Amino acid sequence: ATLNQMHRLGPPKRPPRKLGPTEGRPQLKGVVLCTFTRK
Amino acid sequence: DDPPPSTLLKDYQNVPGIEKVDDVVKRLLSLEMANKKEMLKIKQEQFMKKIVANPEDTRSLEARIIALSVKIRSYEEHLEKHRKDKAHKRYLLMSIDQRKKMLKNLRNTNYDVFEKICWGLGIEYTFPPLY
Amino acid sequence: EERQRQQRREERRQQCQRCWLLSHHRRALRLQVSREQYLELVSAALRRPGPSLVLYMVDLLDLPDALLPDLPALVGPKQLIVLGNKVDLLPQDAPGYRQRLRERLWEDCARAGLLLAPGHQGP
Amino acid sequence: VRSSVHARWIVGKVIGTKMQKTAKVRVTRLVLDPYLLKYFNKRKTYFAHDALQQCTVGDIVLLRALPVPRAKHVKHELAEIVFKVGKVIDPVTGKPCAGTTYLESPLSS
Amino acid sequence: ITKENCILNLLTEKEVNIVLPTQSIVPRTFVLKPGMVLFLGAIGRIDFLQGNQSAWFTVVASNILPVHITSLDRADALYQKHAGHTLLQIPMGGKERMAG
Amino acid sequence: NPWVQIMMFKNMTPSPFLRFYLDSGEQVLVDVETKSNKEIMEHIRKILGKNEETLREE
Amino acid sequence: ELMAWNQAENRRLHELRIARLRQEEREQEQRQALEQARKAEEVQAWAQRKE
RNA sequence: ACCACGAUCAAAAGGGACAAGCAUCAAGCACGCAGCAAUGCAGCUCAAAACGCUUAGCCUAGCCACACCCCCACGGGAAACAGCAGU
Ligand SMILES: [K+]
Ligand SMILES: [Mg+2]
Ligand SMILES: [Mg+2]
Ligand SMILES: [Mg+2]
Ligand SMILES: [Mg+2]
Ligand SMILES: [Mg+2]
């Protein structure tokens, strides 16, 4: 991209990072509903 | 308005003794018996006399504008008959665009000559749309 | 002023003689009558045999419609299209609420003695 | 202490003359891109009081801050016309010119 | 056909303009326990009582009709104090209107 | 000089030149035709540039 | 004093400009003389052919 | 100073500058000018991003905003630790 194009577009904009299963928290408290096994 | 058919051709108008000549040779040497290009040349010569300061200088921007204007008149006259001539439609539209460009340059460089051109050729200069 | 500009926006989303005639237009459009007065004045013309159609209009917010069971006498035995108005003013509780409203109108017609004949029916 | 207007002297091009005695002028400044460290033109519109209505679209003008604003957006007045559109006079030699060519030679005088 | 038993008959032009929604409705959710009262304007009221547990009440009405929650004991006094006026914006006209 | 308005003009006059507008309203014209860019710098520094002594006091 | 010096330098460059332009005028005169001779020859030939 | 000349400090007011995302927010709808006024002109912003929605205290010797809620607080809801300790 030319200098004019980079001036127009501006600095690169990193998308917001995706929240995981913990929604960005170290731990979470939960209540067990049922126990089972998976293969 | 077109030049009278009895007017002599541009090349046979300064030859000495052209007034001492028989009527038949005058007819042979007139716009009556020439194709349209000589009539357009006569129109161009008349406009050059009427508008520009130096009618002999043909490389000036005003001269080019006058030439393109007579060409545009020719294209409009042609398209008045051949309504479905797409090639000459393209040529007319283009020629109008470049005459607008030349008028813009003349306005930005020489306003007095620009006014004289716009009055002489009956051109109404219009500013381009913003969007 | 604020509501005026708001209704201007809604209109945007939608996209001597004249004076008194427009006044008559408003007055004639705004005419209203009672139910029994309707039965004794307007039903006669609407029960003339021929080719006809009724665009019955019902306000979605104001349901059930107590006028719906009375249509057989009001208009007669002719073709009827029910139009639920003011659907834009309804909050979207869940996806496909419009289908639920259409169905509910269908059962509301069914509860009354109205024949439901949607779509192609036969010769 | 001579005026309450921030921009005191500014040069611009006239882009509008549809107002009565007011010219809409375009003023360009050079702004440094903090990342690229290249200078780009930033444009700003100003309204200049033109008492005599002598502005034409395209001419380069100089504007002087008024002692106080005379209107909501009119804060400057036309001090002079630096370059009249199509009627430029070469400041160095004082002769009329058309673009880069002299309309009249300096030697004529 | 004119609807019988309609509030809009009783209300005046301005009050009808306020009550009738003109923009899309936004719901308003309120969790109520037994012994509480909901006021929709001065026109509607709901008393919740003898309930084994809490419940949720979602008001779908014009965005410019106030919804006010109170206890059962204070509901009557509040209604008399603020009938008309601005807390319960419909109807309007102070105590003169509420006579009719 | 971040607060000084610098503006450019192309092919409007037969000769190049610089023009300075001062706070008093005065105009200073500096013809730069036939001059080198370093000469232009030295000239403008000499006529309208703060001397080294003033910078040292600042 | 600095403004006076700037004016003096402008006048000096103006004198140099006059010198250069007088030179250019002289070579332009001789060039256009030659070109006008060529144009005169062409005009004579063309006009005689038309006669 | 204390008599103010005026310095320091700093409101209101005028000019300028001043975060991020989204154009699947592209038109805004009176946003301008001239005249002592009467009134006249039809203008103003905008793809160099107007108008709009969403997000976030900020540019930290510190600054801005708020002080239960109704932006505000005559009035009303209603009875207040976002002062310290504490629950
Ligand atoms: K607050
Ligand atoms: Mg202030
Ligand atoms: Mg926040
Ligand atoms: Mg408060
Ligand atoms: Mg505490
Ligand atoms: Mg608290």
XYZ file of C-alpha atoms (C1' of nucleotides) and ligand atoms in Angstrom:
704
model
C 0.000 0.000 0.000
C 1.239 3.471 -0.893
C 1.927 6.152 1.699
C -1.307 7.928 0.777
C -3.280 4.698 1.174
C -1.742 4.017 4.587
C -2.447 7.603 5.655
C -6.069 7.194 4.557
C -6.576 3.803 6.206
C -4.649 4.698 9.359
C -2.901 2.466 11.891
C -3.844 -1.235 11.834
C -6.790 -1.967 14.125
C -6.529 -5.301 15.928
C -9.986 -6.866 16.419
C -11.131 -7.209 20.033
C -9.869 -10.443 21.539
C -12.355 -13.291 21.890
C -13.643 -14.143 25.359
C -13.257 -17.800 26.275
C -15.491 -20.119 28.311
C -14.632 -18.230 31.521
C -15.534 -14.882 29.880
C -12.110 -13.496 30.730
C -12.168 -14.549 34.400
C -9.584 -16.741 36.200
C -12.147 -19.109 37.726
C -15.906 -19.456 38.023
C -18.196 -20.995 40.621
C -20.688 -23.577 39.423
C -23.334 -26.021 40.586
C -23.103 -29.607 39.339
C -26.224 -30.758 37.484
C -25.123 -34.265 36.452
C -22.012 -36.438 36.181
C -21.189 -38.687 33.233
C -18.347 -39.895 31.012
C -17.347 -39.057 27.441
C -15.199 -40.892 24.919
C -25.693 30.848 -39.870
C -23.588 29.311 -42.631
C -21.408 31.337 -45.029
C -23.163 32.243 -48.281
C -22.687 29.603 -50.990
C -21.181 32.272 -53.261
C -18.207 32.877 -50.951
C -14.869 31.826 -52.409
C -12.829 29.037 -50.862
C -10.246 29.950 -48.245
C -7.406 29.042 -50.614
C -8.829 31.024 -53.570
C -9.670 34.213 -51.662
C -6.335 36.087 -51.699
C -5.206 35.071 -55.202
C -4.674 38.293 -57.216
C -7.255 39.096 -59.860
C -10.001 36.839 -58.492
C -12.450 39.723 -59.017
C -11.614 40.023 -62.745
C -12.893 36.510 -63.359
C -15.829 34.961 -65.220
C -18.919 33.934 -63.269
C -18.465 30.244 -64.097
C -15.005 30.109 -62.534
C -16.363 31.927 -59.483
C -18.967 29.174 -59.158
C -16.296 26.505 -59.578
C -14.250 28.205 -56.847
C -17.082 28.746 -54.333
C -18.610 26.904 -51.400
C -21.495 25.901 -53.676
C -19.278 23.268 -55.335
C -17.182 22.031 -52.386
C -17.809 19.506 -49.646
C -18.663 20.572 -46.116
C -15.054 20.783 -44.925
C -14.343 24.031 -46.797
C -17.484 25.591 -45.337
C -16.260 24.616 -41.876
C -12.840 26.084 -42.695
C -14.522 29.351 -43.680
C -16.490 29.361 -40.421
C -13.263 28.803 -38.489
C -11.513 31.619 -40.351
C -14.404 33.997 -39.643
C -14.404 33.147 -35.934
C -10.621 33.528 -35.743
C -10.937 37.002 -37.235
C -13.804 37.880 -34.901
C -12.355 36.642 -31.586
C -8.608 36.115 -31.272
C -6.047 38.914 -31.331
C -3.690 37.142 -33.766
C -5.789 35.207 -36.331
C -2.674 33.554 -37.805
C -1.473 31.860 -34.606
C -3.251 28.494 -34.545
C -1.445 26.813 -31.620
C -2.968 29.100 -28.982
C -5.595 27.753 -26.606
C -8.259 30.103 -27.991
C -7.599 28.836 -31.517
C -7.948 25.237 -30.345
C -11.212 26.087 -28.581
C -12.605 27.696 -31.748
C -11.554 24.705 -33.851
C -13.164 22.269 -31.432
C -16.295 24.429 -31.411
C -16.694 24.304 -35.192
C -16.045 20.553 -35.056
C -18.752 20.203 -32.396
C -21.171 22.169 -34.562
C -20.382 19.762 -37.395
C -21.072 16.752 -35.163
C -24.410 18.180 -34.023
C -25.428 18.863 -37.626
C -24.463 15.291 -38.532
C -26.339 13.726 -35.610
C -29.453 15.754 -36.421
C -29.855 13.382 -39.391
C -28.175 10.132 -38.247
C -29.894 9.794 -34.883
C -28.552 6.253 -34.314
C -24.874 6.970 -35.096
C -23.304 5.874 -31.823
C -19.738 6.571 -32.974
C -20.470 10.211 -33.755
C -22.458 10.457 -30.527
C -19.320 9.393 -28.674
C -17.262 11.881 -30.665
C -19.643 14.756 -29.890
C -19.789 13.986 -26.172
C -16.019 13.652 -25.932
C -15.405 16.861 -27.893
C -17.739 18.730 -25.549
C -15.753 17.376 -22.597
C -12.393 18.543 -23.964
C -13.818 21.933 -24.901
C -14.928 22.270 -21.278
C -11.396 21.342 -20.207
C -9.864 23.953 -22.529
C -12.312 26.579 -21.273
C -11.312 25.776 -17.695
C -7.626 26.169 -18.562
C -8.270 29.447 -20.401
C -10.285 30.771 -17.460
C -7.491 29.886 -15.048
C -4.823 31.478 -17.290
C -6.396 34.373 -19.267
C -9.756 35.722 -18.121
C -10.083 38.465 -20.751
C -9.612 36.034 -23.634
C -11.960 33.660 -21.810
C -14.714 36.283 -21.762
C -14.090 37.103 -25.416
C -14.305 33.421 -26.384
C -17.459 32.837 -24.349
C -19.149 35.834 -25.964
C -17.994 35.129 -29.514
C -18.915 31.439 -29.689
C -22.001 31.725 -27.482
C -20.591 29.293 -24.911
C -22.049 29.312 -21.391
C -19.344 28.092 -19.026
C -20.732 25.971 -16.186
C -18.954 24.753 -13.068
C -18.793 20.965 -12.644
C -21.013 19.176 -10.109
C -19.457 18.510 -6.716
C -20.754 14.919 -6.476
C -41.025 19.718 18.390
C -39.255 16.431 19.135
C -42.239 14.248 18.251
C -42.702 16.276 15.070
C -39.174 15.509 13.905
C -39.682 11.868 14.931
C -42.816 11.504 12.797
C -40.929 13.206 9.971
C -38.364 10.412 10.314
C -41.119 7.783 10.277
C -42.513 9.351 7.096
C -39.005 9.198 5.626
C -38.842 5.495 6.476
C -42.210 5.074 4.750
C -40.636 6.369 1.529
C -59.418 28.395 -2.433
C -61.063 25.368 -4.077
C -58.251 23.031 -3.042
C -58.328 24.291 0.546
C -61.968 23.563 1.320
C -61.950 20.358 -0.714
C -59.002 19.091 1.363
C -60.972 20.058 4.466
C -63.832 17.913 3.157
C -61.302 15.127 2.577
C -60.279 15.171 6.241
C -63.872 15.394 7.470
C -65.038 12.518 5.264
C -62.087 10.302 6.177
C -62.691 10.864 9.902
C -66.368 9.814 9.854
C -67.346 7.162 12.414
C -70.544 5.362 13.441
C -71.721 2.903 16.082
C -72.259 -0.819 15.594
C -76.052 -1.022 15.370
C -76.074 2.135 13.266
C -73.623 0.272 11.034
C -75.959 -2.724 10.787
C -78.946 -0.555 9.850
C -77.181 1.837 7.420
C -74.008 0.409 5.879
C -74.662 -3.352 5.810
C -77.328 -2.992 3.103
C -74.843 -1.835 0.464
C -72.247 -4.400 1.568
C -74.782 -7.231 1.198
C -75.541 -6.529 -2.466
C -74.677 -9.668 -4.489
C -71.796 -9.456 -6.929
C -67.990 -9.393 -7.002
C -66.725 -7.872 -3.755
C -63.974 -8.049 -1.153
C -63.652 -6.862 2.448
C -60.337 -5.681 3.889
C -61.182 -6.073 7.556
C -58.585 -4.254 9.650
C -57.824 -5.198 13.254
C -55.457 -3.499 15.681
C -52.841 -5.992 16.834
C -52.372 -4.304 20.209
C -56.128 -4.423 20.889
C -56.861 -8.151 20.719
C -59.184 -10.062 21.122
C -61.501 -8.224 18.729
C -65.117 -8.219 19.883
C -66.170 -7.073 16.401
C -64.802 -10.248 14.788
C -67.700 -12.588 15.754
C -70.167 -10.003 14.397
C -68.719 -9.876 10.868
C -71.105 -12.459 9.292
C -73.999 -10.050 9.825
C -72.023 -6.838 9.301
C -70.506 -7.614 5.893
C -72.268 -10.822 4.876
C -71.034 -14.031 3.208
C -68.198 -12.610 1.096
C -64.429 -12.774 0.815
C -62.528 -11.222 3.702
C -58.858 -10.417 4.319
C -57.816 -9.694 7.896
C -55.101 -7.043 8.228
C -53.262 -6.762 11.519
C -52.227 -3.122 11.832
C -49.586 -1.495 14.036
C -47.165 -4.415 13.882
C -44.140 -2.089 13.915
C -45.131 -0.910 17.414
C -44.880 -4.448 18.824
C -41.676 -5.489 20.644
C -39.954 -8.537 19.158
C -40.239 -10.963 22.061
C -38.574 -13.819 20.153
C -37.695 -14.676 16.543
C -40.752 -15.590 14.519
C -43.225 -13.610 16.606
C -44.879 -12.497 13.356
C -45.801 -16.085 12.520
C -47.248 -16.512 16.006
C -49.379 -13.388 15.530
C -50.598 -14.649 12.156
C -51.507 -18.000 13.683
C -53.289 -16.340 16.608
C -55.376 -14.313 14.181
C -56.200 -17.564 12.367
C -57.495 -19.288 15.521
C -59.362 -16.115 16.489
C -61.153 -16.330 13.149
C -61.688 -20.054 13.767
C -63.375 -19.550 17.152
C -65.982 -17.399 15.445
C -68.068 -19.066 12.763
C -65.777 -17.943 9.932
C -64.779 -20.260 7.099
C -60.993 -20.408 6.725
C -60.114 -20.983 3.054
C -56.538 -19.802 2.467
C -54.811 -20.317 -0.846
C -56.006 -22.402 -3.759
C -59.167 -24.307 -2.828
C -60.556 -25.876 -6.007
C -62.801 -25.336 -9.039
C -4.815 41.898 22.664
C -5.903 43.350 19.305
C -8.555 40.712 18.539
C -10.451 37.798 20.063
C -10.068 35.674 16.900
C -7.456 32.918 17.004
C -6.366 32.953 13.343
C -5.001 36.425 12.620
C -3.596 36.228 9.067
C -4.514 33.416 6.675
C -4.163 32.795 2.930
C -6.731 30.703 1.093
C -8.646 30.089 -2.120
C -12.187 31.358 -2.632
C -14.537 28.396 -3.094
C -17.867 30.178 -2.668
C -19.488 33.548 -3.374
C -23.203 32.735 -3.033
C -23.577 34.955 0.058
C -24.086 38.705 0.136
C -20.743 40.373 0.899
C -19.324 37.122 2.317
C -16.774 34.855 0.631
C -16.305 31.202 1.568
C -12.546 30.547 1.524
C -10.616 27.273 1.805
C -7.478 27.384 3.973
C -4.862 24.620 3.840
C -2.315 23.893 6.563
C 0.409 21.253 6.739
C -0.138 18.625 9.450
C 2.467 15.997 10.317
C 1.266 12.404 10.321
C 2.561 11.112 13.693
C 3.176 7.648 12.228
C 4.431 8.330 8.690
C 6.147 11.638 9.583
C 4.887 13.069 6.280
C 3.073 16.389 5.938
C -0.464 16.353 4.539
C -2.836 19.197 3.721
C -5.640 19.763 6.228
C -8.472 21.966 4.971
C -10.629 24.413 6.913
C -13.435 26.664 5.702
C -13.488 30.348 6.664
C -15.994 33.123 5.958
C -14.501 36.493 5.008
C -16.361 39.797 4.848
C -16.239 41.173 1.283
C -17.827 44.619 1.411
C -17.293 45.377 -2.290
C -18.120 41.841 -3.529
C -14.872 41.569 -5.493
C -14.219 37.830 -5.025
C -14.475 35.247 -7.795
C -14.374 31.478 -7.354
C -10.788 30.231 -7.609
C -8.810 33.337 -6.648
C -6.224 33.345 -3.864
C -7.017 35.829 -1.086
C -5.563 36.996 2.224
C -7.789 37.320 5.297
C -7.264 39.432 8.416
C -8.977 38.734 11.724
C -11.722 41.146 12.684
C -11.446 42.857 16.086
C -14.545 40.826 16.979
C -16.737 38.384 15.064
C -19.417 40.158 13.046
C -21.511 36.975 12.765
C -21.614 33.355 13.876
C -19.092 32.206 11.256
C -17.749 35.507 9.846
C -14.565 36.284 11.793
C -12.243 37.589 9.058
C -12.213 40.280 6.389
C -10.520 40.279 2.991
C -7.260 42.203 3.315
C -6.429 41.750 -0.382
C -6.608 39.402 -3.364
C -3.211 37.742 -3.747
C -3.945 36.100 -7.120
C -6.991 37.053 -9.164
C -8.302 34.054 -11.086
C -6.939 34.293 -14.616
C -5.572 37.829 -14.092
C -2.338 37.151 -12.213
C 0.323 39.875 -12.107
C 3.839 38.547 -11.552
C 4.861 40.086 -8.191
C 8.576 39.741 -8.994
C 8.499 41.745 -12.242
C 5.110 43.446 -11.903
C 3.895 42.322 -15.363
C 0.660 40.502 -16.275
C 1.182 36.800 -16.907
C -0.790 33.796 -18.140
C 0.456 30.749 -16.290
C 4.206 30.400 -16.756
C 4.424 32.714 -19.806
C 4.528 36.511 -19.814
C 1.564 38.187 -21.487
C 3.745 41.292 -21.909
C 7.523 41.075 -21.809
C 9.400 42.789 -18.950
C 11.489 44.596 -21.573
C 8.457 46.376 -23.056
C 8.928 48.897 -20.232
C -67.230 1.213 14.100
C -66.855 2.963 17.456
C -65.541 0.775 20.265
C -67.672 0.644 23.390
C -65.931 0.562 26.776
C -62.750 2.325 25.638
C -60.519 4.531 27.775
C -59.790 6.748 24.769
C -63.400 7.958 24.893
C -62.909 9.429 28.372
C -59.544 11.046 27.656
C -59.091 14.416 25.959
C -57.113 15.104 22.785
C -53.744 15.619 24.492
C -54.269 12.671 26.833
C -55.160 10.448 23.872
C -52.021 11.668 22.111
C -49.959 10.633 25.135
C -51.621 7.243 25.654
C -51.561 6.127 22.024
C -48.002 4.989 21.194
C -46.319 6.625 18.210
C -42.861 5.009 18.460
C -42.009 1.344 18.921
C -42.775 0.146 22.439
C -39.970 -0.804 24.833
C -41.006 -3.342 27.515
C -40.535 -2.554 31.200
C -39.931 -5.476 33.565
C -40.601 -5.304 37.309
C -40.169 -8.097 39.860
C -42.946 -7.939 42.467
C -43.518 -9.831 45.711
C -46.950 -10.399 47.283
C -48.346 -7.197 48.747
C -47.220 -4.678 46.106
C -48.981 -2.467 43.573
C -48.305 -1.313 40.009
C -49.734 1.933 38.593
C -49.943 2.434 34.821
C -50.641 6.131 34.661
C -53.688 6.949 36.739
C -55.739 4.661 34.487
C -54.591 1.112 35.324
C -53.657 -0.481 38.617
C -52.668 -4.017 39.636
C -52.471 -5.277 43.216
C -50.461 -8.474 43.700
C -51.373 -10.478 46.801
C -51.502 -14.013 48.214
C -48.620 -15.293 46.108
C -46.533 -18.305 47.053
C -43.423 -16.654 45.582
C -42.257 -13.591 43.633
C -43.391 -12.891 40.063
C -42.390 -10.719 37.107
C -44.671 -8.112 35.512
C -43.723 -6.766 32.081
C -45.514 -3.576 31.058
C -46.090 -3.105 27.334
C -47.481 0.409 26.935
C -46.574 3.809 25.527
C -43.064 4.880 26.488
C -44.455 8.166 27.876
C -46.883 6.567 30.347
C -45.222 6.381 33.786
C -45.156 3.086 35.662
C -45.003 3.440 39.437
C -44.552 0.640 41.987
C -45.634 0.947 45.625
C -46.821 -1.058 48.607
C -50.468 -1.927 49.166
C -50.926 0.343 52.192
C -49.532 3.472 50.496
C -51.196 2.887 47.111
C -54.498 4.597 47.917
C -52.878 7.672 49.457
C -50.454 7.959 46.553
C -53.289 7.721 44.041
C -55.257 10.492 45.731
C -52.166 12.681 46.102
C -50.884 12.282 42.525
C -54.040 11.656 40.490
C -53.582 14.005 37.581
C -50.458 16.143 37.855
C -47.103 14.781 36.682
C -46.163 11.612 38.569
C -49.128 9.839 36.931
C -49.321 11.978 33.823
C -52.676 10.680 32.510
C -55.266 12.226 32.945
C -54.289 15.901 33.297
C -55.987 18.866 34.941
C -55.349 18.458 38.646
C -58.312 17.856 40.928
C -60.695 19.618 38.526
C -60.367 16.818 35.968
C -60.561 13.976 38.491
C -64.021 15.157 39.554
C -65.314 14.036 36.159
C 7.492 26.495 13.135
C 4.278 24.524 13.760
C 2.017 27.610 13.940
C 3.073 29.273 10.655
C 0.749 28.644 7.706
C 2.807 27.280 4.796
C 0.951 26.979 1.485
C 2.032 26.089 -2.062
C 1.204 27.337 -5.553
C 2.182 25.623 -8.804
C 2.700 27.203 -12.227
C 0.825 30.424 -11.474
C 3.672 32.854 -12.250
C 6.585 32.717 -14.722
C 9.131 32.835 -11.869
C 9.347 31.221 -8.415
C 9.233 33.352 -5.280
C 8.475 33.285 -1.561
C 6.174 35.725 0.226
C 6.061 36.250 3.995
C 3.101 37.929 5.690
C 3.956 39.497 9.043
C 1.770 40.276 12.036
C 1.948 44.013 11.306
C 0.515 43.407 7.823
C 3.862 43.856 6.064
C 4.769 41.597 3.140
C 8.314 40.414 2.385
C 8.972 39.131 -1.141
C 12.007 36.917 -1.802
C 12.749 36.006 -5.409
C 14.343 32.548 -5.543
C 14.756 32.085 -9.302
C 18.312 30.988 -10.243
C 18.999 30.354 -6.514
C 19.789 27.005 -4.918
C 17.639 25.613 -2.114
C 20.473 26.039 0.393
C 20.771 29.677 -0.685
C 17.023 30.097 -0.139
C 17.392 28.660 3.365
C 20.293 30.970 4.175
C 18.455 34.023 2.837
C 15.207 33.395 4.719
C 17.153 32.580 7.890
C 19.069 35.843 7.535
C 16.089 38.108 6.883
C 13.326 36.589 9.062
C 15.002 33.860 11.153
C 15.860 34.206 14.824
C 19.596 34.555 15.327
C 21.500 31.962 17.338
C 21.842 34.348 20.282
C 18.070 34.671 20.731
C 17.703 30.887 20.601
C 20.392 30.586 23.276
C 18.558 33.044 25.533
C 15.365 31.038 24.985
C 17.880 46.931 7.996
C 17.086 43.337 7.022
C 14.111 44.457 4.930
C 16.338 46.998 3.176
C 18.863 44.247 2.442
C 16.093 42.040 1.044
C 14.959 44.864 -1.244
C 18.538 45.405 -2.432
C 18.953 41.702 -3.213
C 15.659 41.763 -5.117
C 16.900 44.705 -7.197
C 20.169 42.882 -7.929
C 18.304 39.787 -9.114
C 16.090 42.078 -11.198
C 19.148 43.490 -12.981
C 20.372 39.956 -13.679
C 16.898 39.131 -15.016
C 17.033 42.098 -17.403
C 20.437 40.990 -18.688
C 19.283 37.417 -19.305
C 16.066 38.517 -21.003
C 17.869 40.960 -23.302
C 20.116 38.071 -24.353
C 17.107 35.829 -24.966
C 15.455 38.606 -26.978
C 18.453 38.822 -29.316
C 18.626 35.079 -30.048
C 14.840 35.027 -30.411
C 15.086 37.822 -32.982
C 17.591 35.944 -35.127
C 15.686 32.651 -34.773
C 12.372 34.206 -35.807
C 14.142 35.936 -38.695
C 15.263 32.558 -40.051
C 11.850 30.976 -39.451
C 10.069 33.891 -41.135
C 12.343 33.485 -44.151
C 11.224 29.853 -44.377
C 7.560 30.837 -44.009
C 7.921 33.511 -46.692
C 9.356 30.980 -49.138
C 6.527 28.541 -48.420
C 3.886 31.268 -48.784
C 5.301 32.389 -52.132
C 5.357 28.836 -53.488
C 1.820 28.052 -52.319
C 0.319 31.323 -53.559
C 1.979 30.886 -56.952
C 0.594 27.350 -57.245
C -2.886 28.685 -56.491
C -2.401 31.428 -59.097
C -1.649 47.027 47.717
C -5.783 47.395 51.535
C -6.225 55.335 48.823
C -5.881 52.637 43.747
C -2.089 52.679 40.094
C -1.844 47.687 39.519
C 0.118 42.510 40.456
C -1.466 37.467 41.766
C -5.450 34.059 41.291
C -9.561 32.756 38.384
C -15.339 32.393 36.972
C -19.091 33.656 33.135
C -18.621 35.082 27.864
C -15.893 35.175 22.382
C -11.937 32.389 19.115
C -8.938 27.940 18.593
C -7.593 22.732 19.958
C -9.218 18.151 22.118
C -10.773 9.628 22.851
C -11.996 4.730 20.244
C -15.285 1.386 17.081
C -19.167 1.036 13.243
C -20.848 3.805 6.231
C -24.800 -3.193 7.306
C -25.088 5.021 10.414
C -24.904 8.804 3.504
C -27.306 12.233 3.583
C -28.416 16.302 7.967
C -33.345 19.137 7.557
C -32.748 25.201 9.020
C -28.398 23.197 10.398
C -26.438 30.308 6.821
C -25.338 35.413 5.158
C -26.516 40.802 4.606
C -29.029 45.116 6.928
C -29.851 50.456 12.517
C -34.317 48.001 11.837
C -38.110 46.806 8.378
C -36.895 43.168 5.655
C -33.929 40.743 1.541
C -31.000 36.752 -0.391
C -31.204 30.847 -0.119
C -28.182 29.661 1.932
C -25.079 26.074 5.915
C -22.380 20.755 7.118
C -20.916 16.342 4.398
C -17.311 10.205 1.293
C -10.751 14.970 3.320
C -16.777 11.217 6.831
C -21.521 15.658 8.363
C -25.902 13.195 10.882
C -26.363 8.868 13.855
C -25.511 4.176 17.214
C -22.023 1.709 20.571
C -17.723 1.799 23.978
C -14.701 4.322 27.747
C -13.232 8.721 33.260
C -8.782 11.605 31.133
C -3.616 14.188 28.380
C -2.055 11.682 36.171
C 3.045 17.133 40.611
C -2.779 16.168 38.744
C -7.346 17.146 36.180
C -12.797 16.295 34.763
C -17.580 14.659 36.265
C -20.896 13.039 40.225
C -22.629 13.494 45.395
C -29.705 8.023 46.436
C -33.120 8.607 41.862
C -36.215 11.992 38.322
C -29.429 15.103 33.301
C -31.154 19.726 36.694
C -34.085 19.763 42.007
C -38.982 24.884 42.790
C -41.332 20.097 43.095
C -41.672 14.739 43.490
C -40.098 9.518 44.312
C -38.560 8.279 48.821
C -35.790 8.263 53.569
C -29.822 7.853 50.986
C -21.684 5.685 54.341
C -19.340 6.645 46.293
C -16.278 10.377 54.672
C -13.810 6.762 58.518
C -14.461 1.973 61.112
C -17.889 -1.842 60.292
C -22.004 -5.162 58.212
K -26.781 12.629 38.566
Mg -14.382 29.780 31.151
Mg -18.462 3.930 32.160
Mg -28.480 15.152 41.229
Mg -17.021 2.554 54.401
Mg -24.843 4.718 48.226
